[PDB]
Amino acid sequence: GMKNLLGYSEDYLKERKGYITAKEICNQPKLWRETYEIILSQREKLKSFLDNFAKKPNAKIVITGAGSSAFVGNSVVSYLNAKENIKIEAIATTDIVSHPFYYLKKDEPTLLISCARSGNSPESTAAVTLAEKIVDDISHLIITCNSEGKLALHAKRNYNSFLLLMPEESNDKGFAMTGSFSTMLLSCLLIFNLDKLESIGKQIESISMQGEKVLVNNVELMKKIVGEKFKRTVYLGAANAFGLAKESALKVLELTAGKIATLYDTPLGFRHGPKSIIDDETLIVIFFSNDTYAREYEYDLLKEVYSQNGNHKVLAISEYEDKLIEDNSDYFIAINKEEQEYEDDSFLSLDYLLNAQMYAFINSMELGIGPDNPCPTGEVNRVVKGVIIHDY
Amino acid sequence: GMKNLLGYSEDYLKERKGYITAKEICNQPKLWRETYEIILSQREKLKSFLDNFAKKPNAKIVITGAGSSAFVGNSVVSYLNAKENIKIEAIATTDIVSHPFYYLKKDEPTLLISCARSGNSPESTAAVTLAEKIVDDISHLIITCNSEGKLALHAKRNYNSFLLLMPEESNDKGFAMTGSFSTMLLSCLLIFNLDKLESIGKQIESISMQGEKVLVNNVELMKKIVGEKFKRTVYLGAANAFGLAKESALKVLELTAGKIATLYDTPLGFRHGPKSIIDDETLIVIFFSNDTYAREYEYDLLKEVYSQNGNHKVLAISEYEDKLIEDNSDYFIAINKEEQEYEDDSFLSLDYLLNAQMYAFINSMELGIGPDNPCPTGEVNRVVKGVIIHDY
C-alpha cells in the first residue's frame, strides 16, 4: 500500500513539482476543526472587542484583502450584513489603496478586518496605514496565516489591534491559497456567531467529515471531467456563493497559467449577456443554495444551460442528493445524502470549495503544469511583486 | 459624398444586419445633452422627492438593475456613496430576486432606483414587487428608456413612485445597450448634483463635444486594433471605472457571440492572480483616473503589463494626452488635449465608454457577425427569455 493524494502518489506529485499544494488542499478538513478551536478559545476576548466597537455610533465594519483574500469578504458579507444591524461590507485592499477617500471618513468609526495569507502584500499594509491616517476611531482585526507576515507585525504597533492568527500549516507555501482562504472564510462566519459556537461546532464537524470524503470520493469523477481539456470554465453561485464563484474561477485560472479562460457570475445574472461565453469547450459549474426559495431559480437556470445545443458540459454541485439536478446535468456531485442543517447557506462554501480546488489542481497536473508554481517565469507570484505604494 | 458611421456606410451596415446598433452608438452625444435637459426640467420635482426620502432615519438607497443595467449602479456608487451621508449601494435585481431577505428589511426605509432599457426583464418587476412585500417605507425611482416597458407601467400602481423616462431614442432596439446604459449612468450622477446642475451643464457639453470626436477620430486606430483577431480582452478600471470595465467587458463579449473571451478587474487587483489570463492573443485596455494620487498606481501597472514578454497588446485610454502613457503603450487614445475639470472621475466614463462600444462593435462587424442580433439563434436575447419568477 502507498499514499495517494487526489488520485496521485507523493512521489508522482514531487516529480511534477506539485506536492506542496496537494497536501495543503487535503489538510483543509483538519484546519477547519483547528480554526473552530482557535475562535472558541478566543471567544471571550473577541466578544468584548467586537461588542465594544459595535456600540460606537455610525460604526461600520469593512472586510478587506487582495485577490483570493478579497474574495473572503465577498463569500460572507451578504449573510453577515443581513445578520447584523451594523454595516458589514467587502472592500478589497486593492480598491482602498487607489481611492481611500471613497471608503474612509474622519467622523465614521471603522473596524477593518484585514485578511491575508502571507501578510506580505504591500496593499495589505498600506490599507491599514491609510485607515490610521484618515479615521479618528479606527480599529483592526487582523486575520492572517503568517505570524512573520508584515501585516501580522502591525499587531505590535501603537494601534487598536487584535491579531487573530490562523493555524501555522494554513500559511500555504503553494502558489494558490487553499486552507488560507477557507480558514479565513470560516473565521469571519464564526466571529459573529460567538452566540452559537457550541451548536455551530456540531455543524463544523459534519462539514469537516464530509470534506475528507470529497477529497477521496470525487477524485475519479473529477479526473474524467478534466480529460475533456476544457478551454473555458464558468462558475455560478448566488449571494454568498458568488464569492465562492470568484475564488473558484480564480484558482483554475491561476493554476493553468491562463490556459483555461474563466468567468464567474450568479445564475439569474448569467442570462443577461455574460452567458455568451458558452462554447463547446466550456464547463459550467453551478453551486446550489439550500434556501428553498433561492434554489428554485437555480433549477431553471440549470435546465436552460444543459439544454442549449453545443454538447458543452455542466457540473452541478449540491449539498444533498437531488434527482431533479442529476437528471439535468452532465456531471453531479453531492456533499451529503440528506439535507443537513446550517446557520446560513454561507456555510456550504467550505465543502463546495474543495471540489473547485480539485478541478483547479487536477487541470494543472494533467496539463503538464507544476501547481506549486504555475508561473515559474514569475509574471504572477505567490507574494505580489512590483507593487509600489505611493505618497499620501 | 456618402454617410459613414464608425468607418462604414449605411448601406454596408444594413447589409451585414448592423445599422440599428451603429446609429444608437453614434447618437449618444446628443442623448446626453437630451438627458441633462430632462433632469434640469425635473429638478424641482426630483429635489423634493429625494430630500423627503433622505430625511427618513436608517434610510438607504439601492441602485438596481440586471446585466448591463446592474453595471449602471457599479459605475457610480463608489462616488455617490462617498458624496452622500446616506448609504448608496449597487445591488443587482438578479441578486435581490434570489435572496430578497439579505437586502430588504421591514424597519429600514428604502429607495429603490430601478434601471432598465426595455423594462421587460422579469427580475426588474419582481425586485420592485419584493420590496413592496417586505419594506414598510418603500419608494421607487424608475429610470427606464421604455415608457411601454413593464417596469414603467408600475408608475401607475398604488406605490410611492417617480417615473424618470430617458429619451425615446435611448430604448436601443439593438441587442447591446449603448445609450440606454450611458444616459442612465449620467442620470444617476446628475440626480445627486441638482445642487450644481448649471456648472455641471458646462461639463456635459464638453463631454458631448469630445464624444462626437471619439466616434469620428478613433475609427482608423480602432480598426487596426481589431485586425489582430484578438481572442481575449481585459478591461481594467479603478473605483467608478470598475463598473465601466464590467460593461466594456460585457459588450465586446456579447457582440462577438462569445468568440472573444473577456475579463474585467481593477489595475491593483489584476496582479493578484487574474492577470494569469494574459496570453499572446490578449488585448489589455486600461482606463486612467484623473485623480492624481490614484493615477500613480495605473502608471506602474501599465509599465508592468507592457513589459512582460508575449508580444500581446495593451491599449491605454486617458482623459488628457500623456507622454508617459503613450511611451508605455501599444495603442493610445486621449479624449482631450489638456486636462478638463469634472465634479468627480465617475464623469470620465461617458467618453471612455464610447471607445469600448466601438471596439465591441467593430469586432462584431469584422468577425462576420450581425451586431444588431449577435445571437440570432437566441441562446442570449435583447429581452431576457426563460426567466421564471417564483412564489414569495
TrEMBL record, chains A, B:
It catalyses: D-galactosamine 6-phosphate + H2O = D-tagatopyranose 1-phosphate + NH4(+). The keyword Glycoprotein does not apply. GO terms for biological process: carbohydrate derivative metabolic process; phosphoenolpyruvate-dependent sugar phosphotransferase system. The keyword Hydrolase applies. One of its GO terms (cellular component) is plasma membrane. GO terms for molecular function: carbohydrate derivative binding; hydrolase activity; isomerase activity. CDD domains: SIS_AgaS_like, SIS_GlmS_GlmD_1. Residues 49-202, 218-374 form the SIS domain. Keywords: Hydrolase, Isomerase, Repeat. It comes from the Bacteria. Belongs to the SIS family. AgaS subfamily. This is Predicted phosphosugar isomerase. The lineage of its organism: Bacteria, Bacillati, Bacillota, Clostridia, Eubacteriales.
